[PDB]
Symmetry: D3
Subunit: 150 residues, 6 copies
């Protein structure tokens, strides 16, 4: 169903390298509808909440430090298989091995600084969406382009 | 001084035609720093507040109706002469006469549906900025690219 | 009214320099609806018909020779003030003085080889449209994006 | 040999979403020479002819309905291994799984509405070319850029 | 005549902001032929030689300091009225007032840091060309695209 | 380590088809720092030196002939895993099979004329770098964007 939403965050390096317009534009071209969008500086607890899955790991500290070291542009897109696609569009973990055409393959070069975040599954998606956005901030009446779906 | 901020809003047609990424990207290229960003559906009073200057006019009703007829992506950019430039980048009132290269000249075709809004002066800028964004939502520590200014 | 159509032809140099996709795309972005499109090699009489206005001139011969020296991609776009805009988008006669952002200013460099043709007035438009296209070849039910016009 | 031609059609959604210029431009960049180009609304029999291979299938009806539900921009490109490449450029059947960089991966999101058609083999290519274009409509003297081939 | 050459230098900010590919590409699109290209860090005397015209001025010191504060990508393009056009493409002195579409209007924001240099006249052009490049470094057999000139 | 450099050369067809700006720009986006850049016409011995690895082969003659048949824009980029990435960005040997998004997949169509050269390994990289550039021509103080690496 085309009511699937995912959560993506242009991390501090993406924002600070001026990649915001490029990234949103890529998903708008693909056809996905922007449902929520806000630039914010993540707070310690939000970051720790977001990188929960790694809190038992050594490199969790970094995660959190960075994500809160500067503004992040958070957004939620909706469309058929959006969670799946978005990842495809974003690339692999290591920017260097991400293929040309993908967000990280085109602009990425490190793994720590890999510009963007995308929920890895529909489950992490709904956890992430609700975690960063208040229901108030999300669109309801989406209504996607009718030339997009059969 | 490069602490000048302006207010721009991608109106409903711009957002609905997928022009969001293009527009933000244009200002990021130019060098301006994104200080505030949020997609929202304007409310009657906010719209009436925003199109105040025309409330005594007949065509004020339209203004308000439209601006609230769909999501709008509001944003505030900061940089040297940002208010002046942004307008230059956006084009004239009539999209048709806006020159190629400008936002409205490239994508615009009507005047009513002219994709974007930009504060017309630094005064309307500060009124508009504070009107659409809560201080909480705006960056403080801007820190612009050092290759931008002498 | 937004039922105005104009006639544009990517001349042989434009086609041969691979400018076809760029040009059509520019008008599609602007919002104009493609009503007729066909690649053809103009014939002597069609060319002489098209450059009629100059048949009494010395440099009419050239005009005709060139326009028929290779394939030309002819097309008709429709939209509010399309005839006016299209010219604005295309640039001036001398490519060199056409401004950056315009078709000829971006890719043009000579005046003889100035990539594209655009009807100069709505009158020459209807003469040109009917001259290059058979009514069969033109769309009827245009139906332009509703986010384009108020 | 570089006299290989393929047939591609920007279906109704591609045309109606303004993807025409983008698509032609992509093949012009790659180096392929545009041999035939025309926008037309396919007719029932032409569509049924084109989707012949599926006439015994249930979902043949859809195929035909759609392809004729709006204008289609048909074109024929020629170049070394054009049939093979074009497909590579266009993407897989499911837009969602088409990779970033490909036509369907960049702009596609459904499978039914997958923007473009490309002959699947050189055989279907020649059947498709001759089916949509009259020999009159196709270039003869192609003459491709000499910096393209050894 | 189309044997006119001009001299352009992407100053340190342009190079350091990653504008090199964009700028060269813009002139290649326009049709001009790249005759000389080299990245170098200007030396005091070369810079003082280049900003000679201002040596009697107070702000000559800055000029020189900057131009040598980092690598510069120097290049010479040739084409009909190249000196005139290039300037048109580059924009005015103040990036902020340069129009959208122009190099400085699109990416520029200060006047001191205005990304690029272009000879202001054909005279300063030949002085600048010979000053930064050794004849060895410049192409001789230019041979421009035949679809560029009548 | 991010002090890895590779050597790339836009061969004669790439340069002559106006692909120079596009290619440099792609690597600048990815984040790599331009360390050396110069347009030159390779000489017989330099070409024979460069295509040494094939001198015992029949098709070595071609290699050499071509590479010296016109100007080549040589350059050296530096960054984390630059040698690996650059190849990924450039594509496979056969342009036709290179994937969309890659340099050769987007603009390439033959194998002989495949636009660009990239050192195939870090070893061939250092041999190639030193072979085409004099140490004088290469940057020392690279200093890459701090938003690129962790």
């Amino acid at each position: 169903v085309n009511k699937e939403r995912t959560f993506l965050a242009v991390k501090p390096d993406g924002v600070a390298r001026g990649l915001v317009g490029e990234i949103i534009a890529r998903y708008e071209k693909k056809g996905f509808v922007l449902v929520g969008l806000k630039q914010l500086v993540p707070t310690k607890d939000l970051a720790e909440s977001h990188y929960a899955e790694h809190k038992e790991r050594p490199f969790f500290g970094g995660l959190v430090s960075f994500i809160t070291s500067g503004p992040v542009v958070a957004m939620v897109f909706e469309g058929k298989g959006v969670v799946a696609s978005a990842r495809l569009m974003i690339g692999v973990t290591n920017s260097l091995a991400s293929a040309p055409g993908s967000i990280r393959g085109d602009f990425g070069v490190d793994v720590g600084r890999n510009i963007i975040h995308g929920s890895d599954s529909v489950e992490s998606a709904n956890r992430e969406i609700a975690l960063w956005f208040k229901p108030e901030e999300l669109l309801t009446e989406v209504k996607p382009n009718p030339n997009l779906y059969e």
